[PDB]
Amino acid sequence: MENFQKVEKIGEGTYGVVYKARNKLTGEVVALKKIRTEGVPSTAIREISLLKELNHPNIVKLLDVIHTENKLYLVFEFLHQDLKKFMDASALTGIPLPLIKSYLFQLLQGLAFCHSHRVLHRDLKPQNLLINTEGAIKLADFGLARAFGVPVRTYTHEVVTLWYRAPEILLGCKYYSTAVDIWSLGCIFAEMVTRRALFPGDSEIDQLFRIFRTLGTPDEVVWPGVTSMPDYKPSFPKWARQDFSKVVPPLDEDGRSLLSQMLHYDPNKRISAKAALAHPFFQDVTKPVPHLRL
Numbered sequence: 251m252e253n254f255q256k257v258e259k260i261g262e263g264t265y266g267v268v269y270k271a272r273n274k275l276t277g278e279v280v281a282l283k284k285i286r287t288e289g290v291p292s293t294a295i296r297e298i299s300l301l302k303e304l305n306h307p308n309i310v311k312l313l314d315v316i317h318t319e320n321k322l323y324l325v326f327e328f329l330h331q332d333l334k335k336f337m338d339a340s341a342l343t344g345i346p347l348p349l350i351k352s353y354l355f356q357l358l359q360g361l362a363f364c365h366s367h368r369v370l371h372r373d374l375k376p377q378n379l380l381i382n383t384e385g386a387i388k389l390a391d392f393g394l395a396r397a398f399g400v401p402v403r404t405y406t407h408e409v410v411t412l413w414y415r416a417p418e419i420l421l422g423c424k425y426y427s428t429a430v431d432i433w434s435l436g437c438i439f440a441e442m443v444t445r446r447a448l449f450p451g452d453s454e455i456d457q458l459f460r461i462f463r464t465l466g467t468p469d470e471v472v473w474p475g476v477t478s479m480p481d482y483k484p485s486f487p488k489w490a491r492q493d494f495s496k497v498v499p500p501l502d503e504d505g506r507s508l509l510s511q512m513l514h515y516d517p518n519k520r521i522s523a524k525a526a527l528a529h530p531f532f533q534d535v536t537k538p539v540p541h542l543r544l
């Protein structure tokens with residue numbers, strides 16, 4: 251509003267426009283997201299407001315929710331860069347394993363926290379993971395997708411990224427579980443390691459088939475109930491599971507083991523954030539300093 255001097259437009263955020271802004275009073279620099287509409291639901295107000303108490307070091311703090319004049323403003327703690335930009339910037343050399351491990355570990359701590367408080371992210375992707383110079387990484391936009399159905403096209407009709415969507419969502423499941431976030435994080439882990447998106451689908455069916463081509467078309471053996479899912483079709487081609495060592499080379503077996511558990515088809519077999527934190531892969535985790543050029 252007028253209490254915020256806009257510094258620059260960060261982008262066309264998932265729900266709306268995002269600006270880097272400074273509070274004229276406090277001098278605090280924040281990210282301000284403007285969200286779209288018949289007056290903006292009041293149901294979302296109670297919901298969003300609840301997320302203000304969801305405070306954790308690996309969760310971008312939601313400082314304030316402001317509903318006014320058919321506009322909804324979300325004020326967030328500001329971080330200078332997202333993981334997508336960082337991965338692009340580290341494309342030639344790759345993110346060092348120690349840093350990949352630190353980020354994965356921190357993200358799992360953040361998910362463990364949200365999940366223990368019954369909050370799901372639902373739309374984890376590199377762009378929603380913010381990083382700073384201290385080596386921290388934080389989850390952004392956590393429980394927002396709840397009172398906002400399912401993404402598809404931002405106000406600028408931008409294409410919704412399905413690359414990190416769990417198979418149960420693609421198969422039409424009506425109830426998401428914490429497992430969807432573990433799946434997305436597994437996809438991100440793989441991408442940090444290989445420097446290439448794991449399943450870059452360009453349509454819902456292409457996304458699903460890319461997953462099937464790599465992990466094998468799921469069946470009742472590995473995923474009880476899958477053939478009864480809303481969008482499951484007996485006509486799906488049946489692809490054999492690819493040898494896992496081919497998926498994220500040259501990741502070591504500790505890493506491959508954890509990733510395999512984060513990508514199990516059955517949401518109920520998929521590892522929890524809490525359990526993943528105890529995986530041997532993190533035995534030598536540390537907190538390196540990233541090379542950020544702001």
Ligand SMILES: NC(=O)c1cc([N+](=O)[O-])c(Cl)cc1NCc1cnc(N)nc1
Pocket residue numbers: 259260261263264268270280281282283310326327328329330331332380390
């Ligand atoms: N909380 C935040 O700091 C933040 C929030 C949103 N958002 O609520 O939509 C977005 Cl896009 C980006 C953010 N920061 C990363 C960033 C900073 N600067 C520039 N130029 N690009 C990215």
